[model samples]
Target chain A: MTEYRPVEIFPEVLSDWPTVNFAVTDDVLELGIFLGERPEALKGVYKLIKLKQKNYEYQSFLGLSILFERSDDGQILYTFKEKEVIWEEEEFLLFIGVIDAVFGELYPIGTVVELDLELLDAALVMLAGRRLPLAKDFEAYEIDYFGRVWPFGEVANIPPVFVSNMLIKNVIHMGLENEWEDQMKEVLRGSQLELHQLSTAFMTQSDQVAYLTYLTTPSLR
Target chain B: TEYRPVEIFPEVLSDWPTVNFAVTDDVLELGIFLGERPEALKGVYKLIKLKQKNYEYQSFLGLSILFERSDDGQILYTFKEKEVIWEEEEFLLFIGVIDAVFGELYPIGTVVELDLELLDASLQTMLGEAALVMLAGRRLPLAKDFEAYEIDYFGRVWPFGEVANIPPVFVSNMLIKNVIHMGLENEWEDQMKEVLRGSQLELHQLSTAFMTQSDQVAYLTYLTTPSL
Candidate 1:
């Protein structure tokens, strides 16, 4: 049986004259079009436009911009106009996940952000740099968060399961490899989860591609 | 067993000085006398004559000797004018007759100020005598040694058994605990070990200074007043 995933919604750009707003919903993982007010002349397909057959670039109504590419091996790659510019699928999605976790409902690009999530970002980069391999053992591993040592059980509560599940759905919808889905399913099946597990899972190449695709692409349920 | 009060003479001139002495251990009424040595001396002489039949009185010119006969016929004497002063500066000379067992003399409410320096000195003497056996492997500059010195020269003086006062033991414990905490916090760093080694050495020096100051005070107090 083909298991059904959550539906995806592309953002609708009302105008194109430097409009900035987000209509993100948990159930409806939005992508593609912009969702907010803009000038009348620069209306449809201005926010995000397909450059080539499988390449897309999304210029946010605000300053943020995203570029999505599909490699020949069905790998999804992404780049932000921000720092470091390029990201694999997993890093990109994890970035998105971090954004959602840090700034929920406060969608303005210039919004003040929490320092805790900012530190978490640095930690994530360090984890990536280390290129630590993933295994099921991470479920029981302990992580250091905000200076205190926390078991996976405790750190798992920071980003709720629903948010991760939604992120997983976005990955599947992006037309990327589905290995992340299997691993995520394994994670969900476990009675407990940990920050290390999520970190290591996303570090894997396939998982990164899946999440990056999920964040940048809009698709049907 | 029948018990009798130990008669204290003011001017025996033997060796022991008759200072204000009280023992709470045995069954005895508390008696303390200080000041006006002449009157005290007269009172002691009168008491001696009153018990003349109970003891033999002998005189060798200015030097007079009286031997008292106890129930066990034990001969105890008082020699006057011989002025033979056995000036011994031992730790035990100050502490008279420490009985094996004792009880509180007055009610619990009465307050007293203990001479901590004297107590410390007494303990140090006892420990020093036993150090050859007890401190076999351990070298000098032990933790308790530091504590003893710190407590000895603490600026504020505390009453003997005041409830509100912070004891020297408490202060010493805090210092030692602080040292331990410092050690724990920097245990991971080799550089920190160097820093802490200096700190520990400094603390030992401070303790030694305190001990020296305490000894000075004790010596002065002894020279000025025998009873504290």
Candidate 2:
């Protein structure tokens, strides 16, 4: 029982309910969040894969499986490539919309961004704040934006290029806005961050991640 | 709502046990009231406006006369004051959905009873108590004098149609009662839907005028005699 109870990852923002409990398998990651402090009742279980094992994986839940975390193992990916730690920390930067170290407004689905590519004129972003794989099967390295060629959309067999802050030369067109798009923004953050938070607390020698930073973090506004 | 009474009335004849339809107490009351006391309908209309004064004219007794009201004050009322039986929430819904109110024709095998008290003696006894709806949304190509009669339904009574040597009874939409046991609704009924949606008065495509005194009396006289 390699136990870790840095509860802030469940973040009181999501729940400051009566109490909470968590459980995980020593061999694997069931990583269960249970009701109260009891293993009998269940809140929900979030699954996290280790760096060594396949890229990203989880047991199927009936509930929606949203993008939870994005990772960037750039130098590791220079050796490897991929990911976001906190949802907000990496959710599209200037959605007014930024970087590899991106932090700010998240971009909308329709925004067109510029990349210093040789052939394509523009990269029209069809994705945002999603924990997508750099390579489809090996998608551990999720990033800020994944886009298609501006005028020429999805290049048949080829995958859409990722538009991390470092790759974006400039934003060619503004992103989509409206109630529908606004609602989309709120959703991409939470569980994806929670995914990052859970994985952080688990696969560590300390069995501890950054919870104090999240707890005293106030949304007093 | 004030308007001219509809020119529609039952054609001057129907032979005993032939081409006859059943009506509930509400429709019978509507016809009898207007036929027997023609002027009082105006008074009743005014009285209904006073009672509810809401949509068109609705009386406390549930006798209502719907009118097509326009921007100007000219109100036109349909002579119909019967219970829109299909509209009743109590009736089992058709087409596996419950949206329409008296909107579609009752499915096959819906049984309804008539207010036969107003009928002549032998007519009441022999015509049978409850009529089971069979063919609905009809146009009898040659009803009587080769005149194409558009009817709401054709009803049949068991053993009566068999023993009485009469064909199914012709009925109007207004003649229907609320107490119904609607029949099987599946793909078989789906075919009926396409057919019924056309010329089906229940399809919002139209209404019934008052049943007439001359015609009722004529029907009664036919039953009274039975000679011809």
Candidate 3:
């Protein structure tokens, strides 16, 4: 039941990001999940989750939230909320639980979410260069080719992330390494698979399904 | 502490740099007077001077008088060695006497060039009346006193009447020598005529001499000062 921390990837192994490999649009970004007939091998790596909401949730357990208020008369009568969760675990270890699930079910094993263009671009630049100065506060999580967990630190001054990494992955998917098995191993490093439970909940939602209400309490991990 | 207390305050109603004349304040204020010897006062000795800021201590002979108001509306007062300056060997200084209350003064326009003969005559008459009133033990009505006239306040006047026991050796001279030495050729005649016309009341004499020998320095000097 050892916990896997994504930040451990830095200094330990990842000297620089596989930039040219990552920057090319044809590359595969193995996010530690399976797409085909292969059994769920690695199940305990971390995954970054993104969700869009009309407003932010202030509560800590729910997720990170910030409030933005605007009014013509200086009165804040309305609010919009945004929330997201950072799940830490080994991807292969966590996926082992869903191995019995049917096809086209549960976090679409090989589906790579296209990140924002600027954010991807900055990520590519950060991967190619030395320790970036403005990397504070930015957090990225991934499972590498060796099934090892890799967490990306935030560097602000570098170019935006979406353009460098995610966008490049999105355009071309053939020549790039799709080391899916290794990424799954990275994701399954520990029993930290519980961190990604919320993400699985989000991915399971049907397109037609409208409302999602959180039911978790002050439960111990 | 500096903002405390109100003295005999004169209320200035109108905004500054205005031409209108109105007495909103309780204190008396007079405008520029054009007449010579404006209504003379009793009880106060009326004094008149052809110059200002007497320099008797420097030279005892002739009063090294400074006719402060130049003909062209320029003011020239005596200065010490420290204050006087020369730009390219040209003398230039500011107006006023050194360390005297009434010395470094500025007078009004009318006072400087008023008709001196009529002023002298009026003063003689007023003095006679004031003397008689003093003997009769009557209350003297104070008009504007001539002795107190200053360049800044009223008219330019000298306080010293005589040097020792003799009347101050009065000699009328032109600034022609200075002008000539200073290289004022055509401008000298023009300035001379201006001083004469401005000082004397006789317009005819001024015009006549101006027409006769406009370039002659002697005639210009004569025009500047004529016997009453």
On residues B46-116, what C-alpha lDDT tens digit does candidate 3 reach at each position? 11123222212223333132323333323333322112212211111100001011111110111112233
For each candidate, give the interface RMSD after superposing the true interface residues on Cα: 31.4, 29.6, 51.3
The candidates' DockQ values read 0.01, 0.01, 0.00
List fnat per candidate, in order: 0.00, 0.00, 0.00
Stretches of candidate 2 exceeding 4 Å from the true structure: A1-221, B1-103, B117-139, B142-148, B158-161, B164-168, B200-228
Off by over 4 Å in 3: A1-155, A159-168, A171-184, A187-221, B1-228
TM-score of chain B of 2: 0.36
lDDT by residue (A80-119, candidate 2, tens digit) is 1133222221111111010111122355554556664532
Encode model 2's per-residue lDDT on B132-223: one tens digit a residue.
33332233332232122234555454212211244445544434444343333445456655565433323222221122334445545655
User: Clashes per prediction?
Assistant: 6, 22, 74
For each candidate in turn, the TM-score is 0.15, 0.23, 0.13
Docking class of 3: incorrect
